[PDB]
Amino acid sequence: EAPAAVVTGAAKRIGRAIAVKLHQTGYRVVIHYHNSAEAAVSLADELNKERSNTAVVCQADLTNSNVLPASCEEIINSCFRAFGRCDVLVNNASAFYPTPLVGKTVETQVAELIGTNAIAPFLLTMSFAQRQSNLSIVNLCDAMVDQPCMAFSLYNMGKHALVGLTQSAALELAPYGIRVNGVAPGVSLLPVAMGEEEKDKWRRKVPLGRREASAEQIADAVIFLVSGSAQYITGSIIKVDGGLSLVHA
Amino acid sequence: EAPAAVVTGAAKRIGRAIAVKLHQTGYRVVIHYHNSAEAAVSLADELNKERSNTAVVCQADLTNSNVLPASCEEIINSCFRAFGRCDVLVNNASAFYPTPLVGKTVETQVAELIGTNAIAPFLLTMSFAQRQSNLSIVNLCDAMVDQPCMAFSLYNMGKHALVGLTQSAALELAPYGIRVNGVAPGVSLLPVAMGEEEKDKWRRKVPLGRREASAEQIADAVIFLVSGSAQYITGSIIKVDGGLSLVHA
Amino acid sequence: EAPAAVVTGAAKRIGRAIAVKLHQTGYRVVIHYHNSAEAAVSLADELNKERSNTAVVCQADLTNSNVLPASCEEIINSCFRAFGRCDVLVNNASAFYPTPLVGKTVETQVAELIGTNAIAPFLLTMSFAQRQSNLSIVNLCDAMVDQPCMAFSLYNMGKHALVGLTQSAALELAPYGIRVNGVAPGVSLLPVAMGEEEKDKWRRKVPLGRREASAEQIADAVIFLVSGSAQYITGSIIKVDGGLSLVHA
Amino acid sequence: EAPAAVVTGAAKRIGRAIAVKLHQTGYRVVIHYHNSAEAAVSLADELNKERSNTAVVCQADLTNSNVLPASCEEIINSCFRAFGRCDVLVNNASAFYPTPLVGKTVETQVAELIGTNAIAPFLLTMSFAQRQSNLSIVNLCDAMVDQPCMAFSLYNMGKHALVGLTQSAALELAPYGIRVNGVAPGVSLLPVAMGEEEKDKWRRKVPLGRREASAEQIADAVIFLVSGSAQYITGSIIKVDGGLSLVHA
């Protein structure tokens, strides 16, 4: 039987690209989404058109709350129900918006930014491990985590927590043969709420080609880490940033 | 007149030593505490006996919840109520216990470990900044954050988030002349819950002196960072670890 | 036309595995060596018997001296002379022995350790760049660089410098399309006549499998980095260490 | 009896400020210099006036060569000959100039940049240890080491090696009671060769006050690390950068 993967926030953009590349590599996939239902089902349709019974969807909010653990357990369970196994978890889904220190309440900002970027990854990691082969987890980190965006403190705190999870879970799950790694983009697919002049501002900062990464380039590094060529790699975070993090102010 | 400082979890151990040193340097202090009411009240009394009405107690659970923002605003408020100003915030309070990936619920563990180590610090930081010469914040970090204790994922995640806050907040509050730094103990005062064979193992690991740091040694770095000798220092985390973090497995 | 690579210290152990693996992917290779002449020529023979005119040797001492720049230029020249091009440079040669702070002179220890691990890589990088598709350089780093072996200060200095080269050259050569990355082993092929006690100690410290990396596992990360699957990756160092670097003392 | 310190490159700028602050703190000082002979004797004169026989000069080139170890030995010996003891070594002297990868020879560039920033510090550290209370060494590092200046690869390699030396020497000298730490400026005293256009560009990048650090501000951090308030601190590098290293491109 083919191995199976859960990719969170996989309806669009980088997660979709990762689910496609995993599917093309031979994986069956759980396409987790929150609001992008049409895009999710549309993607599952297409992957199933290529290989029947190889893709399902799973809806969940990954905001922190007292039921997040049950939601994360259900995501992993949905993979076992569909495919009878769960070999790969990709923690991709991410809330991203400014939260200045000086519409949403602060309680909600905390719950969304810390829940999606860190706590859900942790609970998903727990459920993945408890439900248990080249088993691995890839976390989508941030190459700029030590040179953060102005006024993105909660988002940055989440991404730093995710580095911590990557390290602590690599350490703890190693005896079980589960590898835990990260992929850290710089600028890749640019936010939709961003004008051309802003996009060119960011592009111009990247030493290697003065362009953003394609979603597929981020996916390539994911594919490497889950592959048999990375069987001794755990606790490593691969930057896929074109040198951006190397550039001083 | 004299500056004022909030120290969280200041009733005992390291937070106490920090509150005392700040007080001996001339600060008025808010002694925050959670359960240790006798030790807290007793400490404010000892300090007030030295200098009249230079200390107040303030109780608050710093576990994450929908009331945590109000709680943190009230801690900062209590410093302004008592002293008319708030020059220094020290984020010291911390829950610390194992949370294995494989009698508290996971959601309580998340709330306590991430709340105390990261979320409360962010909220205090926000409140501190909104209420605003040498203003500064000192976050109690962890020298071993990249070599974490087995099965302490949530704690480590919290301490990573706290690095992120330290960096993000230094960047964002610099324009208001608020510095934000960290002090990172290795092993200092050893926990009550730890075994003797484990206690001595830790001491022998320390290159410098094969002993743990005193609470006072930790405090000395806090005093340096809040002083006028640290006026251009922001976004820095000083390890006070006797070389422990340099030691391989 | 097949791409060509220079691998330094390619006669044995990890460098040999890298040469073999690049040759298997379709590269012609220059096998650089210092003293292991028989192994180097035996490797070249084997690779040429596999595909004709795809392997040569180049001998050079990579000790720091006033002739080092010419030696490094000669190494890069030898690829162009045999193959007409040079697409990949792998900086793998390394002196490794203790240099306590308290038979070789210190002058020689500095020359050997800093020369092989840092300055030769830098000179080689300069010669490679100046002579210029998918061009890259991979530097063999050290996952334990921040938790060094006791009394190995010059070696550790060399490997830190090599990080700095990796970053600095990534930044400077990105406009030319030359990527510069690192692979950082923990414990791999265990040095000859290490005791069974010692080896076993090291193995038992590795979280993932309690075993050292095979030279091939180190080579797999090199191959990935040179590949078209790493096209946006520059200035990244990938640890291949089984989680060794995550393990506290 | 007054303790004694060696400060390399102390005739001018930051090393001067450090020697001055050490002397004001009670130390006798060896003012090492290379070309700035008049500045150096002018400083020893100014200090000796305040306190008789408490300052001497010592001329030495700290370029790498086969006699560099003798030169570093003699610097240390100059402290013993003048003061009977040597308690503090500050590695401040530094060559700084671009060395592009694509009229000094490269040999000379390597010797000057690696010698002054790394090898001389190693050899000075060796001699300090071997020639032997509150003994310590402070290395002047660089807060921007992971975000290098374009075309400054050799300078950057040397500063990375100096991080490595700080860590390795901290580990190895801990048992002997010698602490080893760093201070990492961002932008401080602006080079004399620079024009007020370019100076302002640098100043504008600094979040904490849009200004370079003062030499005294750097010196303040050195004084803290040599003091009894840093007695458990070893292997720590304190950034004094005004948040500059936290600012993305």
Ligand SMILES: NC(=O)c1ccc[n+]([C@@H]2O[C@H](COP(=O)([O-])OP(=O)(O)OC[C@H]3O[C@@H](n4cnc5c(N)ncnc54)[C@H](OP(=O)(O)O)[C@@H]3O)[C@@H](O)[C@H]2O)c1
């Ligand atoms: N794009 C970049 O340049 C960049 C840079 C650095 C790091 N990264 C990281 O790479 C990963 C992918 O980036 P991206 O730009 O593709 O991400 P994105 O479009 O910003 O987010 C991916 C998905 O996250 C899901 N999500 C958001 N909030 C959620 C919630 N409360 N509960 C459940 N799911 C939620 C959304 O699902 P629905 O659409 O279904 O609602 C969204 O499609 C992220 O972790 C990101 O942080 C990206």
Ligand SMILES: NC(=O)c1ccc[n+]([C@@H]2O[C@H](COP(=O)([O-])OP(=O)(O)OC[C@H]3O[C@@H](n4cnc5c(N)ncnc54)[C@H](OP(=O)(O)O)[C@@H]3O)[C@@H](O)[C@H]2O)c1
């Ligand atoms: N000890 C070490 O060697 C070491 C090593 C690494 C890092 N650190 C860090 O340095 C700081 C001080 O260390 P420590 O050993 O002194 O800390 P600790 O004794 O373990 O905790 C200090 C205080 O935190 C408060 N706290 C715990 N949970 C709380 C909650 N839910 N709400 C509010 N307050 C809470 C407690 O207050 P009450 O007693 O009033 O309930 C406690 O006295 C901590 O941030 C710690 O993470 C210490």
Ligand SMILES: NC(=O)c1ccc[n+]([C@@H]2O[C@H](COP(=O)([O-])OP(=O)(O)OC[C@H]3O[C@@H](n4cnc5c(N)ncnc54)[C@H](OP(=O)(O)O)[C@@H]3O)[C@@H](O)[C@H]2O)c1
């Ligand atoms: N093995 C591990 O566990 C490990 C751990 C961390 C990092 N690494 C890094 O990974 C790389 C490969 O490791 P390894 O164990 O295979 O290395 P190695 O066998 O110790 O040395 C590789 C080669 O370096 C060459 N060399 C040594 N001194 C030289 C000199 N003065 N001039 C020219 N070449 C010289 C030697 O060539 P000849 O044999 O031809 O004389 C030797 O075969 C190294 O850069 C190492 O530092 C390895």
Ligand SMILES: NC(=O)c1ccc[n+]([C@@H]2O[C@H](COP(=O)([O-])OP(=O)(O)OC[C@H]3O[C@@H](n4cnc5c(N)ncnc54)[C@H](OP(=O)(O)O)[C@@H]3O)[C@@H](O)[C@H]2O)c1
């Ligand atoms: N200034 C900054 O903004 C900044 C930024 C980052 C790091 N740092 C570090 O902080 C330290 C001080 O900075 P700075 O600007 O004061 O340094 P600097 O003025 O550039 O150099 C200090 C001294 O180094 C000595 N030196 C240069 N080449 C030498 C050689 N071949 N042999 C012996 N000595 C030599 C010189 O002595 P003579 O004049 O006597 O010849 C010089 O006065 C340096 O280590 C620097 O890298 C400074």
Ligand SMILES: Nc1nc2[nH]c(-c3ccccc3)c(-c3ccccc3)c2c(=O)[nH]1
């Ligand atoms: N979930 C999510 N996370 C993101 N992080 C970044 C980002 C953060 C710091 C530095 C650069 C990019 C981005 C980002 C992507 C392109 C340009 C700017 C920011 C991003 C995003 O679009 N979605």
Ligand SMILES: Nc1nc2[nH]c(-c3ccccc3)c(-c3ccccc3)c2c(=O)[nH]1
């Ligand atoms: N709040 C709180 N945080 C702590 N962190 C540590 C610690 C964590 C990682 C490595 C070493 C010490 C400790 C700790 C203290 C002594 C020995 C081991 C761990 C500690 C603590 O007692 N209280």
Ligand SMILES: Nc1nc2[nH]c(-c3ccccc3)c(-c3ccccc3)c2c(=O)[nH]1
């Ligand atoms: N050239 C060269 N470099 C090496 N570095 C290491 C090493 C260094 C620090 C931590 C672990 C391994 C090693 C090393 C390899 C196995 C066990 C211990 C050290 C090594 C080597 O054999 N050759």
Ligand SMILES: Nc1nc2[nH]c(-c3ccccc3)c(-c3ccccc3)c2c(=O)[nH]1
């Ligand atoms: N010896 C020596 N080292 C230096 N390093 C820097 C520096 C390096 C990287 C980033 C910022 C400053 C500088 C420097 C100082 C001010 C402006 C730009 C660079 C500097 C210097 O003047 N002398």
